[PDB]
Amino acid sequence: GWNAYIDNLMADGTCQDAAIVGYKDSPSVWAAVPGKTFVNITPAEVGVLVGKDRSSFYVNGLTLGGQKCSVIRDSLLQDGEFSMDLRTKSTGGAPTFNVTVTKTDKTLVLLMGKEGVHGGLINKKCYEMASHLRRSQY
């Protein structure tokens, strides 16, 4: 049934990757876009996302699916706005994308926009889905 949430997030052509990852007990990808990046998220990576250090990945960044990202704004554990904004550290090459990780009770909804898509658009999309998820006890 989780297949429909990825299709939902990707239905309007503005995103290039999306994933719903469970983080309680044993982190695992419940659904992700195939052949992409988030599908390869590891439990160690999820660890950093929900970790205690909230101002260390700020100068050293972090990775999602092997991909190095830059934390631009962190409010993942903040009451109300349980979101985090990142850009794709295209330290090499050029292409950069906006990413948003949103947290619910049992999951993390991840979203990556296509080249040039406005960050708040990706933030809105990611945030509203997680809002739906937590109201449904997820």
């Binding site: 049934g1 989780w2 297949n3 429909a4 949430y5 939902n8 469970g22 695992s28 419940w30 889905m129 739906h132 998820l133 449904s136 006890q137 997820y138």
Partner: peptide
């Protein structure tokens, strides 16, 4: 988002 899917499996 649609209805909540079943647990993983």
């Amino acid at each position: 988002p649609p209805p909540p899917p079943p647990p993983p499996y």
